[model samples]
Target chain A: SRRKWNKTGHAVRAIGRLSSLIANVYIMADKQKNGIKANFKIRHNIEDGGVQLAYHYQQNTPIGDGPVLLPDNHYLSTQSKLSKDPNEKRDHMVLLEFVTAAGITLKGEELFTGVVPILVELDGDVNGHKFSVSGEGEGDATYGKLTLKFICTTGKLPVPWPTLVTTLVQCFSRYPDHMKQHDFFKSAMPEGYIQERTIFFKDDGNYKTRAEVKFEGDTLVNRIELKGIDFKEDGNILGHKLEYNQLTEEQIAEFKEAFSLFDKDGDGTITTKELGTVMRSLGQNPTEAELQDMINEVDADGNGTIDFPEFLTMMARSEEEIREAFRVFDKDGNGYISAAELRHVMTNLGEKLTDEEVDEMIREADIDGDGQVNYEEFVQMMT
Target chain B: SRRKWNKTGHAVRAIGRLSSLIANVYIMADKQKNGIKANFKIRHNIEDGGVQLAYHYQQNTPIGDGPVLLPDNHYLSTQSKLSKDPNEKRDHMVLLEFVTAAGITLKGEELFTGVVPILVELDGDVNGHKFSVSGEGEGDATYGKLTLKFICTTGKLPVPWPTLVTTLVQCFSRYPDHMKQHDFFKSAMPEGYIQERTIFFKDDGNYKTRAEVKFEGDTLVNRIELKGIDFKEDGNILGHKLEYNQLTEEQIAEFKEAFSLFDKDGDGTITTKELGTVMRSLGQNPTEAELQDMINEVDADGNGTIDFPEFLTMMARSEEEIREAFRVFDKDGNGYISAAELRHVMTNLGEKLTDEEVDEMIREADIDGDGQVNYEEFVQMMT
Candidate 1:
């Protein structure tokens, strides 16, 4: 039940996401101790059955010797759900109480007052689809209730940007070979190069087609390919648009080291011999012909070797895999492996290193020279 | 299911309660990351079905340029029930996650380390009961789990003093007639005068009989009464001693005015006429005889009037009542009624009070004189 007013004066705000619509709520209150102020705005979309919401609230204490001012500085946000009661329209029911960054404990319900249906204009674009929507309140304030009605019409609802990006990153890192065969990547890669040259996917909306990429200083095309072939500026790749953040500096460094490891001779290129050596290190022994074929497949430069950039195009580990590996020696998973962590891991592996020896080892691998081996340094040292 | 240490380093802590006993847990990790340091203390009181817990954590980052410390200064308090699953013994599965006052989200489980099952001595007393309990751990750390066994003996848990005092105040102010018939209050009040004089319930364990109370300028046993005859200084009132805090000055001031309101004509006395007037104002029309009887009931001075001290003894409002009335005009319920609030309330009542009038009204009622009527001032003003 929504209460008129309580000792700790506050008004709750509810934000909801339905199929193709988003709703933001604000409750403006009167200055009386107990009574309805006004239900300033109400805009609802109830077409979709399943809706998720985030509830928020803020305390509005009046300035000294004057009327109370509705707090607009900060708000506490928490998970909530649209009411399932048959009679309740689109009102949200908060699931848990939470304290905001500003230190106020907000409870569920007990926040509505009077109702005065007001028109609300909505304007925003999702993916490439344009939507100009409007909504208004539809109920009176008898027994103090507020309700809304929203009308939305548009093209298909696009996949949420974050979810699409996160899923793409996950699939690429954990299933490189499987992803290459998947229809999503199949449609995105070059006509027949899926089985030949290594392909690196880049999510850039500025390009009109898949563009070739070169190394940091090398002029030769080195397998940097945009998301899809002949992709339009606003077109979708794998049913998603450009939204993911660029790879971090640390990730790029790790990727470089991973490719360098396959290069074998510090020449920044991997020959058939280097591929065979790597296979042996992983407890596998491929025939010389098989190694040569594998190298020939990704050696786009035709220099008889897979260069660092080409190797990256062939396959790069996922963020999860890097975190998992780093966690082993990084122990606490704090992104760095200290001397103490090195000692503990070594001891568990049936080897013991004195504190001095552990310190010396970290110094040799600590690329930034901070007395600890960070993820970048660890990747470089291992490769 | 609880997993053993993964390649990445992290520890998990678990604390559970079984029945009547409270269990406290502490995980002392070794300097090195992988193994046992110690189980500093464990005390279990498993007897009940549901138990509440307060989980805590702190960040421990080594100084120097290593890595950012994973936030550790946090605690998650929750209630959990004992598991009924055949495989899960005395373990509690926390259902909710919480962020600390310092802004770090705490997750369920994943927080314990190595174990030594060290004994912890308990030394706090509940209510009037005295207990000295000792408990220890009695399980091995196999499959990376820490288990324990405990034993405790005690007399009884005492009711918290504040709760008792609050209830007492509530009953006195809101249910005066009914409380007069209650066994607890009946025994606490003076004999033969139950139907006549005002009574002040005193929680004193030190006196064998009711002690004398002195007013601002007089000491004539002005309404002070005791819980037991001959209370003593070292005795417990309700199993606990030295637990109640003194009432605040604001509360005292409010009480004084509440009494003064009944003192009619500003003579610090409420005659039969005053009693009748107050009753009629409340929509009750008492007969002359009934008015005399009511006046005689609380008029302790035998001067045919109820004095200020006698009125205070007759009634003491609870925190809820004080808050409720304050909230009425307080509107916003931020604990104060400013000039704007006063104006709003007066306007709602169809009164045309200007800002100046509202300011004047607030100033007259604001005893603390900060230009606003706080809960204390509002209570004093209404009474």
Candidate 2:
């Protein structure tokens, strides 16, 4: 009570779309799609210096040509904020429970919003906030209760105004053909833009820029080296625990120079031959046999190269980091990617490629028929 | 559906203490504490430009020295934002249901919080948004339901950077003795500073400076001549709808000149004798009887003068305007004012005043003994 009010530091997080984790939401019925889709913004008041939370659970619609979408009016909104408690440590505390109402809508004709009252509390000491929600309400007609909790973390360092301004590059529903040409857009998807730009939690209070994960694979993976590697539970690579963070600037610089040999041609994806050169440059020598297994490890089937998505998977953190890996290829942002879309990225960045060779690569991760590469197939391919 | 996203324009408002309207909230049984104490913020994304809402409901502790305050955990928080729908016009749409859990405690020993789940919706076409909250929950072991609605409006034009910065004068819970010397802080109460500062809904989207409402009472009051005026059903002074807004700069300047004659010395407040002189200056004549009625009309007691709060009521609109009238004299902000305080402002203005003279004045509006001037007494005095 004695301290003068001064607002500083904040978090800018775009959940659901980035993390691809599901919130077991019991709305009207057991409703599950691509997770609880909402854009959450947290900050201290510009006027009162009281911390505030504002969010909007955007409506998702089923794309006739693609996959799952819950549709608009599933929830309508002009989201507002709730101030935080000053007495709590970590600037933390509980928010009063608000609620939700949404109805199942494979059929648009029913047009009824099932109301579910939700009570949510946010508490955490470090890294990020632990969000717990509890509720009991009637669904599409049946009664169901919604009680679930999820942990979310985002960059904790304050996003400066200039950086904040440049980050607002308006999203395109489809990847711009001109931008996606070659490896211009990183991956051949709009999702690539999200990864290259925007910030994610590093589990530490600090943040890492694009070059860090872009040059080196995700550092959060279990102990895996330049070649033969050991994977762990939760899929972390290189013998690292998912809980570790605090990526140093110098570490990223070192990783950048290490990857400089891997993609010397600037063609984006690193091939088996390039991997051998970089592995040697990093003071590790792997047999050509082990190199082939590495190619097959990241990209099975035909093309013997690993793309930036695989690179990020190698360099990143958490299950969110893994989904983000899948998200890179999910160009249409429909939660999955088509075979043709996969081939587009592979074909653009290469010494040379043919249609038949790229097609076999899809079938390996394509579980049902020549269907899309859903998260499961992608995870299995990575495994 | 085809429009490109570009976010601009917003509203900034401080409700409750400004308007002083009570929202009848039923928690565990019947519970109400000095209106829902929340700080609300609304804006479009700095990045995505999605409409966002953020708020914080601060806990009020009983001043013990004064009136009622609902101790917190009441609600704890670090409020985040919920983004709004893009399809709705004026960026309007429905938000999901959330909840509230607060227990009534005249006693701190019986520490328990009653949980109430609340669902709120916002819809508005012009002027400002209409907020409606609906809920059904148990309160203090008693089953009580909460269903309420209130309309709040704030500065519609985006708050400019420079203006937003200087306006963050951290509030002093108690009026600074140094600042309160003379009329440096406007009304004797901190409420005066809130009046002179902060942006309120001006019916029109544009904003007016301190002089607009300071030199003049709120322009929102119904048509009141310098002397006699008509009072309306909702307590709008002159003759106007609380719904109308869009005040003109020219109009404020003219009122500024008009009030210049009223508070000629700038010593704060105008007495009955000065009222007669200003009435004449405005090209109107009022006999001493009408002058007495004017004093009796505003102050209702023996002071025979009007403070800024009373003056604001004279120039303002709505029941909020009238309560704001009382708020000026309620220096402690305890929803009431002590007789000594009522006399402090009265004595400082123009002619000298004695303890007995102020004491008689307090009894006039002091309904019970030498007790404080609660809202009812102030309203009765204003009437």
Every candidate's lDDT: 0.32, 0.29
What's the residue-level lDDT of A237 in candidate 1?
A: 34
Worst 10 residues of 1 chain A by lDDT: A10-19
The CA lDDT at B21 in model 2 is 17
Write model 1 residue lDDT over B1-383, tens digit each, in one string: 00111111221000000011222112232234221111111111212211111122211212123221122221111111121224533321111111101112110011111222333233333323444333333211111112222223343323222211111100011111111121121122121011111112233322111222111121111121212233333434343343222233344345444444444455445577865654444334545544544444444323455544444434431333344445556667688788887666545433455677667676667788688878766656544
Against the hidden reference, what TM-scores do the models get? 0.18, 0.16
TM-score of the B chain in each candidate versus the native B chain? 0.23, 0.24
**Every prediction's TM-score for the first chain?**
0.23, 0.23
lDDT of 1 at A375: 80
Query: How well does candidate 2 score on lDDT at residue B172?
Result: 13
lDDT of 2 at A315: 47
Task: Give one digit per residue, the lDDT tens place, for model 2 in A1-383.
Answer: 00000000000000011111112112111136331233322221222222122221221212122222222312211111123334633322222111222211212111112422322222222123222212112212111111122112232311221111111111111111122221111121112121222222221232212211111121111110011112222322121222210334333333333333356675445667876664443234555544654454343112356543334233433333345445445667687768676665443222134666556666666778746778787666654
DockQ of 2: 0.01
Can you write out model 1's per-residue Cα lDDT over A1-383, one digit (the tens) per residue?
01112101110000000001211122233235311111111121112221112122211222123222232222111111222234534321211111111111120011112222334343333334444333344222111112333333343323222221101100011111111222121122121111111112233222111222111231111121212233234433335442222333344345444444455455445567766664454334454544544454454323455554444444431333344446556777687888887777646433335777677777767768789878877656544
Residue-level lDDT for B243 in candidate 1 = 26
Off by over 4 Å in 2: A1-262, A265-317, B1-383
